[PDB]
Amino acid sequence: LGSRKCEKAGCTATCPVCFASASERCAKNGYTSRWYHLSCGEHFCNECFDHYYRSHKDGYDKYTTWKKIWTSNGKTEPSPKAFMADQQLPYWVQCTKPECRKWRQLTKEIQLTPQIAKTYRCGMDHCSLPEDLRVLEVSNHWWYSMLILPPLLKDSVAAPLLSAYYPDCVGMSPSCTGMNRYFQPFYQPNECGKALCVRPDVMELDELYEFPEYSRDPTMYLALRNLILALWYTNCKEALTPQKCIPHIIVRGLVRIRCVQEVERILYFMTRKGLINTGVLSVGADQYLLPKDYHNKSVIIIGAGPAGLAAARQLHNFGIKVTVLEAKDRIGGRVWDDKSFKGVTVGRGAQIVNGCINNPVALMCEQLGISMHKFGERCDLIQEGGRITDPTIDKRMDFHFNALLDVVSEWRKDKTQLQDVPLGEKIEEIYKAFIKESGIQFSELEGQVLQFHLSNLEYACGSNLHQVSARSWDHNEFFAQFAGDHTLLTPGYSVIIEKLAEGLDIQLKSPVQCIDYSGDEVQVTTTDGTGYSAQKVLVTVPLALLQKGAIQFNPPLSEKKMKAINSLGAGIIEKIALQFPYRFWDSKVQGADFFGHVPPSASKRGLFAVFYDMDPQKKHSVLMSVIAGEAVASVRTLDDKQVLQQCMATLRELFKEQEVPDPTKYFVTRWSTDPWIQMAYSFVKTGGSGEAYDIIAEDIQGTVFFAGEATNRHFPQTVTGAYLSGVREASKIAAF
Amino acid sequence: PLGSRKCEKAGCTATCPVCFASASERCAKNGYTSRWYHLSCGEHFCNECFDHYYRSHKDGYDKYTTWKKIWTSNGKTEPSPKAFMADQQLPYWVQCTKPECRKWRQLTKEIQLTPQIAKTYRCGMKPNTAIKPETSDHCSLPEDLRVLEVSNHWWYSMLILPPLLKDSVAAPLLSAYYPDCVGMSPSCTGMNRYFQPFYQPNECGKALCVRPDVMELDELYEFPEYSRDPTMYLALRNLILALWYTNCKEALTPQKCIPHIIVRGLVRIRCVQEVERILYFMTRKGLINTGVLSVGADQYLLPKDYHNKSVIIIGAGPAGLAAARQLHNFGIKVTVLEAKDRIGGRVWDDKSFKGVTVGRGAQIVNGCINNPVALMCEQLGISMHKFGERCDLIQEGGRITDPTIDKRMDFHFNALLDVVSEWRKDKTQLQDVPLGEKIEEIYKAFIKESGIQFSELEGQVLQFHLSNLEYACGSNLHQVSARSWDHNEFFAQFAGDHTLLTPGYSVIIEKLAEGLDIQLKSPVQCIDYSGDEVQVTTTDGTGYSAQKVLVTVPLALLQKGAIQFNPPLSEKKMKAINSLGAGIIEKIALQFPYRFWDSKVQGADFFGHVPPSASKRGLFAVFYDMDPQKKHSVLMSVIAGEAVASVRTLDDKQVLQQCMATLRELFKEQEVPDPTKYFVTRWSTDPWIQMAYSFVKTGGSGEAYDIIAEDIQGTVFFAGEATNRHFPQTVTGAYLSGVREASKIAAF
Amino acid sequence: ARTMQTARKSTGGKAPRKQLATKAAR
Ligand SMILES: Cc1cc2nc3c(=O)[nH]c(=O)nc-3n(C[C@H](O)[C@H](O)[C@H](O)COP(=O)(O)OP(=O)(O)OC[C@H]3O[C@@H](n4cnc5c(N)ncnc54)[C@H](O)[C@@H]3O)c2cc1C
Ligand SMILES: Cc1cc2nc3c(=O)[nH]c(=O)nc-3n(C[C@H](O)[C@H](O)[C@H](O)COP(=O)(O)OP(=O)(O)OC[C@H]3O[C@@H](n4cnc5c(N)ncnc54)[C@H](O)[C@@H]3O)c2cc1C
Ligand SMILES: [Zn+2]
Ligand SMILES: [Zn+2]
Ligand SMILES: [Zn+2]
Ligand SMILES: [Zn+2]
Ligand SMILES: [Zn+2]
Ligand SMILES: [Zn+2]
Structure with a gap:
C-alpha cells in the first residue's frame, strides 16, 4: 500500500x-x-x-x-x-x-x-x-x-x-x-x-x-x-x-x-x-574551570579580606588573570587569628558562624576536614558579684525587650525615610510609655537585665542604639536568612582565608591611592607610585575607608553612591582575650559556652557583656569578651594594660565568692584605629535604608566593581556575606 | 525564745x-x-x-x-x-x-x-462524701x-x-x-x-x-x-x-x-x-x-457599662450586619439603615433553581482555616464543598489542551509575575506602572532576547491566565497597580481549603440580621456630626440621630459622593478613597434539563475556556458546576476585565446567546440542550453598589485601606471590604471590618 | 488581589515565606 x-x-x-x-x-x-x-x-x-x-x-x-x-x-x-x-x-x-x-x-x-x-x-x-x-x-x-x-x-x-x-x-x-x-x-x-x-x-x-x-x-x-x-x-x-x-x-x-x-x-x-x-x-x-573564552581578560582586586580573596580565588580558578593589592602587611582583613595561646586559636576579629545550613563557610569547612563546635543555648546572666540571675527575671525581660521591638516593628510600618528615628530613642519612648500606662515599675535588677539585652543588640549593630535606624535596623530579614546551628569556628577563619589565598598573585603593603578608569583601561596607582593596570577593577575596601575617601576616583563616584555610602554606618566593637593558669569558672558556669555580665549602670552596659569559653573541649583556660556600644568610646583613651584591669575587676566581681588567678597572657583589639580598616561591620544609620547596600554594589560602566560585607544587602556584616559578595562580583566580571 | x-x-x-x-x-x-x-x-x-x-x-x-x-x-x-x-x-x-x-x-x-x-x-x-445537712x-x-x-x-x-x-x-x-x-x-x-x-x-x-x-x-x-x-x-x-x-x-x-x-x-x-x-x-x-x-x-455579652450608647449603621451588607449583631450582643442600641429593599448587599442568592442555590454575588470561601465563615458554618451546622484542583482548559471547540502545553504556559505566566516582583522592588508610588503594561513590556522584551516563538495556542492559553488575574482584581490589568496589586499578601492570609458555600452566603446573612432594627428602603443622603450628636437624614427627609455612626457603603458610592458629609471628609481620605479602584465582574447562571458535560468534565468542579483572542478573554473564562453532588445540572460563569464593558449595553437575551455560543464551541462533539432557566447579574448598574470588589489603582498603596478605615473625631466610623487591608474584596474581609469597628465603637 | 482567585491560582511574585522563631519551641 x-x-x-x-x-x-x-x-x-x-x-x-x-x-x-x-x-x-x-x-x-x-x-x-x-x-x-x-x-x-x-x-x-x-x-x-x-x-x-x-x-x-x-x-x-x-x-x-x-x-x-x-x-x-x-x-x-x-x-x-x-x-x-x-x-x-x-x-x-x-x-x-x-x-x-x-x-x-x-x-x-x-x-x-x-x-x-x-x-x-x-x-x-x-x-x-x-x-x-x-x-x-x-x-x-x-x-x-x-x-x-x-x-x-x-x-x-x-x-x-x-x-x-x-x-x-x-x-x-x-x-x-x-x-x-x-x-x-x-x-x-x-x-x-x-x-x-x-x-x-x-x-x-x-x-x-x-x-x-x-x-x-x-x-x-x-x-x-x-x-x-x-x-x-x-x-x-x-x-x-x-x-x-x-x-x-x-x-x-x-x-x-x-x-x-x-x-x-x-x-x-x-x-x-x-x-x-x-x-x-x-x-x-x-x-x-571555565572554557578559554573567559580567560582573555585581566582584573585588579583591591583588598585581601574575605570579599577580595573570594573573587580572586574564583576568577583565578576560572582562568582569568587576577592580581590582588592589599594595604596591610598581611591578608585576612577583619579576619585575624592569634595562634599564640597554648592549644587554642582565638580570633581578634571574626570567629563565629551564624547559621550553618547552606553556609559557604560550612561547605569550606567540609573541604578542609575542619570541624565546628555548635554553641549551647544556655547563658546565665551573672551579677556583681556572685548571684546568678533568676531565670524568671531573665525570661521576663527577654520577653519585654522583645515586645518593645514588636511595638517598634509596628510603629515603623508606613513610615518614610524622613520620618525615621533612632531605634534607641524609640525603644526608650515606648519603654517609658508602658510604665506610665501600667502603673507598676521595675526593680533595679529588672532594669539592669533589660540593659543587658540593650547591649546585646548594640553588640549586634556595632553601635550605640541612638545612632541606628528604627526603620531599617533589621532590614535584611525581609529576606531569607541562614538557618541551623550557630557555631564557634574553633580553628579560626584564618585557616579558610589562607587556603583561598594560596598561590594567588597577592601584593602586600600596596595601599591603593588612585583609581583612574577614564581611558581605555583602568589605571591603579599605589601610595608610593607603583602602577598597575587591568581591564576590570574590583574594590573591596571597608565601608569606613570608602567614607574617608582614601582612594581617589577619576571620574569621581556619583553623588548617589557617596550618599549611599554615607547612609550606612561603620559599626565597631573590640575584643579582649585572657589566658589563665586554670579554668576558675567551671564550678559556677558548668561547661556553658558563655556567661553574661549584668551592667551596674546603663553607661557601663557595653563593657564585657558576654564572656566566651574559648575551649569547646574544656581542657584549656582562655576567655574572650567584647566591648560594644558606648563602651568602645570610653576605652580608646585607655591603653592595653588598663583595659585588662577593668576586665579583671569585672571577673573578680562576677566571681566574688572565690579567687581568680592573674592572667598569664592577653590581647586587646584596636580595630577602631587600624588605619586601613577602622571598623568591625556596617549597620543602617538613622534616615538610612537597606537599599544602600545594593547601590554600593552597583558597578560603574561595567569597569569598576564593588564587594565586601558593606555591599551584601541580604547578609551584611558577616564573613559569609563578604565571601558571597565576592562570588557575586567574580560572576559579573567574568561575563563573556 | 527568739x-x-x-x-x-x-x-x-x-x-x-x-x-x-x-x-x-x-x-x-x-x-x-x-x-x-x-x-x-x-x-x-x-x-x-x-x-x-x-x-x-x-x-x-x-x-x-x-x-x-x-x-x-x-x-x-x-x-x-x-x-x-x-x-x-x-x-x-x-x-x-x-x-x-x-x-x-x-x-x-x-x-x-x-x-x-x-x-x-x-x-x-467537705468534698469527701456527699452533702448531708448540717447545723453550723x-x-x-x-x-x-x-x-x-x-x-x-x-x-x-x-x-x-x-x-x-x-x-x-x-x-x-x-x-x-x-x-x-x-x-x-x-x-x-x-x-x-x-x-x-x-x-x-x-x-x-x-x-x-x-x-x-x-x-x-x-x-x-x-x-x-x-x-x-x-x-x-x-x-x-x-x-x-x-x-x-x-x-x-x-x-x-x-x-x-x-x-x-x-x-x-x-x-x-x-x-x-x-x-x-x-x-x-x-x-x-x-x-x-x-x-x-x-x-x-x-x-x-458585655457589662452594662458599655451599654449606654446609640449607633446608626448605614448599609446592611456583611459589614453593616456583622457590626450590627455585635453591638446588639454587647447591649448597645443599634439602628441600621439600608438603601435597597433587601439585606445582604453584594450577597444575593437565587433559590429558584431546582435543588441548587446559586449566588448572584459572593458564594466562594477563599481559605477556610480560622475563617469566620467556617465558624459561622459550624454554628449553623451548615456544610461546604471543597473545590477539586483539576481544571482543564477547553479550547474552541472540544479539544482539551495538552497538559504539556498547559503546564508550559502556567510556568511562563508565573515567571512573568516573578520579574514584575523584581522590577517593583524599591520603586515609589510615583514610579508605579499598570501591572498589565509591565507584563506586556516584559513579555515582548523576552521574545526579543530569545528567538522562542509562541504558537497561537500557547499565546491564547496565556491570555486565560491574564483574564484569570483580571477576574481576581475585577479590572483590566492596565488600570491595576504593579506595585500593590497583591499588597495584602504582605500579611498572613487565610490558609486551608477553598470551598463553595453550597447553601449560599444568604443563610449566614439572614441569621445575622435576625431581630435587628433594620430600616429598609432608607437611603442616607446627608450625615451631620458637627453638632453634639450625629444627625442622619434620608433621601425622602426622614431624620435619625445617635451618638455614633458607622458607614459601610461600597467604595464606588464614596467616590460618587452619594452621601453629604458635614463637615466634609478630609482631603486625605478623599485621596485614599479615590486611589483605590471599584472592581467589577458580572455572573451568569444557566439551568439545563441534564448534565451534558459529565462525559468530558468527569467531576471537575469547573472547566476553563481558552480565549480565541485577547479581546474576548474575559468572556466566560471559567465555568462552575453548581452541584457538588453532581445530581442537578446548573452552570455559573463570570465576565471580567474588558469584557464587562462590552456587555453593559446588551440585554440578557444577548448575553445568554454569547454564553450558549461558547458552550457549543467548547462541546462540539455534542448537542447542548437549551437553558430552561438563567440570569445575568447587573452589579455595575445597581445604584447603591455599582461594583463587585475593590483593588489597588496604579500609583496607589494598600495603606489607603487603613486611611479609609480611620474614624473621625471618634464619632463617624467606616467599614466594608474596602477598609480591611489584610483581607480586601472578600465577604470575610467585609465581615471582619464590621467586627473591628464594633470594637472601636464599644470602647469610646 | 491574588487571594480572590479560586480555580487556577497564580503563584509567582510572592514575598519570601517567613517563620516566627519562638523560644517555647521544641
Ligand atoms: C572584632 C570583630 C569581630 C567580628 N566578628 C565576626 C563574626 O563573629 N562573624 C563574622 O562573620 N564576622 C565577624 N566580623 C566581621 C567580618 O570579619 C567582616 O565582615 C569581614 O571580614 C569583612 O570582609 P571584607 O572582605 O569585606 O573586608 P575586610 O576584611 O575588611 O578586608 C578589607 C581589606 O581591604 C584592605 N584595604 C583597605 N584599604 C585598602 C587600600 N587602600 N588598599 C588596599 N587594600 C586596602 C584591608 O587592609 C583589608 O585587607 C567581625 C569583625 C571584627 C573586626
Ligand atoms: C458577583 C460577585 C461575586 C463575588 N464573589 C465573591 C466571592 O466569591 N467571595 C467573596 O468573599 N466575595 C465575593 N464578592 C464580594 C463580596 O460580596 C463583597 O466583598 C462584600 O459583600 C462587601 O461587603 P460590604 O458589606 O462591604 O458591602 P455591601 O455588600 O456592598 O453592602 C453595602 C450595603 O450598603 C448599602 N448602601 C449603599 N449605599 C447606601 C446608602 N446610601 N444608604 C444606605 N445603604 C446604602 C447597599 O445597599 C448594601 O446593602 C463578590 C461580589 C460580587 C458582586
Ligand atoms: Zn514497529
Ligand atoms: Zn568510536
Ligand atoms: Zn514575703
Ligand atoms: Zn513550715
Ligand atoms: Zn459561703
Ligand atoms: Zn514525525
Whole structure:
C-alpha cells in the first residue's frame, strides 16, 4: 500500500522507521495505518502501538503494569507514547575514544548504565563506521521543539533529596526506586525561606535570563541542574566536570544527546555564578574551570579580606588573570587569628558562624576536614558579684525587650525615610510609655537585665542604639536568612582565608591611592607610585575607608553612591582575650559556652557583656569578651594594660565568692584605629535604608566593581556575606 | 525564745509570717525559722519545710525528686523547692457558690480541687462524701484577710513564680510547646478541622493566628501591666480560646470559665478576677462570642457599662450586619439603615433553581482555616464543598489542551509575575506602572532576547491566565497597580481549603440580621456630626440621630459622593478613597434539563475556556458546576476585565446567546440542550453598589485601606471590604471590618 | 488581589515565606 508520511506538522522525517519492533506485523520501514511521532528521528508503527495499547494484545500486561506504577508516583498522564519514551526507546551512548567520539544507538535490549557510559567504544575498525545521520539534527533548535514529551532522567543522583516532589515535576522518571548535615540545597514543599535554597520545580530569575529557550519547556533544565547540585554536594572536594556528569544522565532516545550537550552549558553557568566548583577548591594547574573564552581578560582586586580573596580565588580558578593589592602587611582583613595561646586559636576579629545550613563557610569547612563546635543555648546572666540571675527575671525581660521591638516593628510600618528615628530613642519612648500606662515599675535588677539585652543588640549593630535606624535596623530579614546551628569556628577563619589565598598573585603593603578608569583601561596607582593596570577593577575596601575617601576616583563616584555610602554606618566593637593558669569558672558556669555580665549602670552596659569559653573541649583556660556600644568610646583613651584591669575587676566581681588567678597572657583589639580598616561591620544609620547596600554594589560602566560585607544587602556584616559578595562580583566580571 | 523572723524580700506586707506547708514534724509554724521563703504576700514556707523536700536525708526528698525528674523532662523552667511548693503543696482556694455569700476559702491540705468541686462548693463543705445537712453556719465566718490583699495591684508583681494552670483545655492544642512556656504545669498530662487558633512552631503565616507565648500588640496596650509579666494573661487567654473553639454555639461566660482555672494558692483568686476582664476584651475585639451566635434578651455579652450608647449603621451588607449583631450582643442600641429593599448587599442568592442555590454575588470561601465563615458554618451546622484542583482548559471547540502545553504556559505566566516582583522592588508610588503594561513590556522584551516563538495556542492559553488575574482584581490589568496589586499578601492570609458555600452566603446573612432594627428602603443622603450628636437624614427627609455612626457603603458610592458629609471628609481620605479602584465582574447562571458535560468534565468542579483572542478573554473564562453532588445540572460563569464593558449595553437575551455560543464551541462533539432557566447579574448598574470588589489603582498603596478605615473625631466610623487591608474584596474581609469597628465603637 | 482567585491560582511574585522563631519551641 506504499510507505507512509508523518502527519506531525513540520516533520523532517522523509522515511520514518520503527524503533520499537515489538509486534510481529512490524511495519519496519514499510507501511502501517499510522506513524506515531516521539521526535524527528524516532517514530513507531501502529502495529506496535496496538501491541501494548489493546487489551487483547500481548504487550498489554507490561503496559498496564507500568501504567499503574506511573499513576501512583507521577502527576503526568500515562499514554502509549510516554511508555515508549520511558521503556522502549533505544539508548544512545557516545564513544570513549578521544579520536572518535561518535554517537551510537544500542541494541533494543541493552540497558544503559553509568558504567557502560564510562567505557563504551564503537562496537561493544568500528569507529570508522559513519555516524547515524539523525544525530546531527539533535543540535538544531527546532529539534527539541518537535519533541513531544520532555526527558525524564533515570536514577538521578538528586532522587533521594527530592522524595517530597512528584518525580515528573523535577525531570525524573516516575518509574524508578551519607551527606553533610549542612547541605540542604533544595527547598521542601511548605518550608519557610532559608538562605541559598533553590526550588527544584521552578527556575530562578538568573536562570530564566541565561536560558530563555527553556522558559517554555523547562523540565529538561531543572532535571540537569538538580543532577549537578546533587553531584557537587555529594563530593565537593573535586571539580565537577561534564565527564563525571554524563554517565549519570540516563534517559532513552536521541534526547539524551541533547542533554549531554546542554549539561556542559548549565555546568559552566552555575560554576560562573558560584553555585558549584566554589569555596576552597583549587586548581591547579592547566585545568581551568571555565572554557578559554573567559580567560582573555585581566582584573585588579583591591583588598585581601574575605570579599577580595573570594573573587580572586574564583576568577583565578576560572582562568582569568587576577592580581590582588592589599594595604596591610598581611591578608585576612577583619579576619585575624592569634595562634599564640597554648592549644587554642582565638580570633581578634571574626570567629563565629551564624547559621550553618547552606553556609559557604560550612561547605569550606567540609573541604578542609575542619570541624565546628555548635554553641549551647544556655547563658546565665551573672551579677556583681556572685548571684546568678533568676531565670524568671531573665525570661521576663527577654520577653519585654522583645515586645518593645514588636511595638517598634509596628510603629515603623508606613513610615518614610524622613520620618525615621533612632531605634534607641524609640525603644526608650515606648519603654517609658508602658510604665506610665501600667502603673507598676521595675526593680533595679529588672532594669539592669533589660540593659543587658540593650547591649546585646548594640553588640549586634556595632553601635550605640541612638545612632541606628528604627526603620531599617533589621532590614535584611525581609529576606531569607541562614538557618541551623550557630557555631564557634574553633580553628579560626584564618585557616579558610589562607587556603583561598594560596598561590594567588597577592601584593602586600600596596595601599591603593588612585583609581583612574577614564581611558581605555583602568589605571591603579599605589601610595608610593607603583602602577598597575587591568581591564576590570574590583574594590573591596571597608565601608569606613570608602567614607574617608582614601582612594581617589577619576571620574569621581556619583553623588548617589557617596550618599549611599554615607547612609550606612561603620559599626565597631573590640575584643579582649585572657589566658589563665586554670579554668576558675567551671564550678559556677558548668561547661556553658558563655556567661553574661549584668551592667551596674546603663553607661557601663557595653563593657564585657558576654564572656566566651574559648575551649569547646574544656581542657584549656582562655576567655574572650567584647566591648560594644558606648563602651568602645570610653576605652580608646585607655591603653592595653588598663583595659585588662577593668576586665579583671569585672571577673573578680562576677566571681566574688572565690579567687581568680592573674592572667598569664592577653590581647586587646584596636580595630577602631587600624588605619586601613577602622571598623568591625556596617549597620543602617538613622534616615538610612537597606537599599544602600545594593547601590554600593552597583558597578560603574561595567569597569569598576564593588564587594565586601558593606555591599551584601541580604547578609551584611558577616564573613559569609563578604565571601558571597565576592562570588557575586567574580560572576559579573567574568561575563563573556 | 527568739520568736519572730520576717521576710527577706522587698515590699512584703508580712513581718510575722505563717507557714502553709505543715510538712516537716519540726515545722516552725508562726514561730522562728532560719529563713522564710516567699511565694506571695500571703504565702511563705519555713526552712524546716524547705529541708523536708530538699535534703536527701529528709522524709520528702523522695516526693520532690520524683516530681523534679518529671519537671525536667516536660518543662523548660528550673525545678526548685519554691516551684514544687507552688505546684504541689500550696492549698487550693475556692469561692463559695452561695449567691449571697461568695466568700473565698482555703481547702484542707490533701484536697485536690477539680472543676466539679469548684462548681458546687459552699463554705465548710467537705468534698469527701456527699452533702448531708448540717447545723453550723460556715458562711458567716470572716473571710481570710489575705483575700482582700490579692486584688491590690502590687500583689501580682510580688508573686515570685508565674501561675501554671493544671488540666487546661488548651493542653492538647499546645503539645508542641513546653507546658510552662504557655502558662501550664509541666507535671500534667474532635474539633472542627478548620479551627486552628494557635501558631505552631515552624509554621508560616496563616490568618487569625495567635502566639501562645507572646502577647499581641493590642493586648499590650489593653493590659500594660502584663508586658513585664505575661504568664498569667497568656494562660487565661489560651484557655478562653480553647473553650470557645470547643463549644462555639454557646456564649462563653466567666461562670463556665472559672471551674477550668485550676491552680494552687491565692493566685487563683487573682486569676478568676482577671479572667473576667480578659473575657470581655476577647468579646469586644470579636475573638470569641462572635459569629452568628444570637444573644437575648437578656444576657448581653458585655457589662452594662458599655451599654449606654446609640449607633446608626448605614448599609446592611456583611459589614453593616456583622457590626450590627455585635453591638446588639454587647447591649448597645443599634439602628441600621439600608438603601435597597433587601439585606445582604453584594450577597444575593437565587433559590429558584431546582435543588441548587446559586449566588448572584459572593458564594466562594477563599481559605477556610480560622475563617469566620467556617465558624459561622459550624454554628449553623451548615456544610461546604471543597473545590477539586483539576481544571482543564477547553479550547474552541472540544479539544482539551495538552497538559504539556498547559503546564508550559502556567510556568511562563508565573515567571512573568516573578520579574514584575523584581522590577517593583524599591520603586515609589510615583514610579508605579499598570501591572498589565509591565507584563506586556516584559513579555515582548523576552521574545526579543530569545528567538522562542509562541504558537497561537500557547499565546491564547496565556491570555486565560491574564483574564484569570483580571477576574481576581475585577479590572483590566492596565488600570491595576504593579506595585500593590497583591499588597495584602504582605500579611498572613487565610490558609486551608477553598470551598463553595453550597447553601449560599444568604443563610449566614439572614441569621445575622435576625431581630435587628433594620430600616429598609432608607437611603442616607446627608450625615451631620458637627453638632453634639450625629444627625442622619434620608433621601425622602426622614431624620435619625445617635451618638455614633458607622458607614459601610461600597467604595464606588464614596467616590460618587452619594452621601453629604458635614463637615466634609478630609482631603486625605478623599485621596485614599479615590486611589483605590471599584472592581467589577458580572455572573451568569444557566439551568439545563441534564448534565451534558459529565462525559468530558468527569467531576471537575469547573472547566476553563481558552480565549480565541485577547479581546474576548474575559468572556466566560471559567465555568462552575453548581452541584457538588453532581445530581442537578446548573452552570455559573463570570465576565471580567474588558469584557464587562462590552456587555453593559446588551440585554440578557444577548448575553445568554454569547454564553450558549461558547458552550457549543467548547462541546462540539455534542448537542447542548437549551437553558430552561438563567440570569445575568447587573452589579455595575445597581445604584447603591455599582461594583463587585475593590483593588489597588496604579500609583496607589494598600495603606489607603487603613486611611479609609480611620474614624473621625471618634464619632463617624467606616467599614466594608474596602477598609480591611489584610483581607480586601472578600465577604470575610467585609465581615471582619464590621467586627473591628464594633470594637472601636464599644470602647469610646 | 491574588487571594480572590479560586480555580487556577497564580503563584509567582510572592514575598519570601517567613517563620516566627519562638523560644517555647521544641
Ligand atoms: C572584632 C570583630 C569581630 C567580628 N566578628 C565576626 C563574626 O563573629 N562573624 C563574622 O562573620 N564576622 C565577624 N566580623 C566581621 C567580618 O570579619 C567582616 O565582615 C569581614 O571580614 C569583612 O570582609 P571584607 O572582605 O569585606 O573586608 P575586610 O576584611 O575588611 O578586608 C578589607 C581589606 O581591604 C584592605 N584595604 C583597605 N584599604 C585598602 C587600600 N587602600 N588598599 C588596599 N587594600 C586596602 C584591608 O587592609 C583589608 O585587607 C567581625 C569583625 C571584627 C573586626
Ligand atoms: C458577583 C460577585 C461575586 C463575588 N464573589 C465573591 C466571592 O466569591 N467571595 C467573596 O468573599 N466575595 C465575593 N464578592 C464580594 C463580596 O460580596 C463583597 O466583598 C462584600 O459583600 C462587601 O461587603 P460590604 O458589606 O462591604 O458591602 P455591601 O455588600 O456592598 O453592602 C453595602 C450595603 O450598603 C448599602 N448602601 C449603599 N449605599 C447606601 C446608602 N446610601 N444608604 C444606605 N445603604 C446604602 C447597599 O445597599 C448594601 O446593602 C463578590 C461580589 C460580587 C458582586
Ligand atoms: Zn514497529
Ligand atoms: Zn514525525
Ligand atoms: Zn568510536
Ligand atoms: Zn513550715
Ligand atoms: Zn514575703
Ligand atoms: Zn459561703
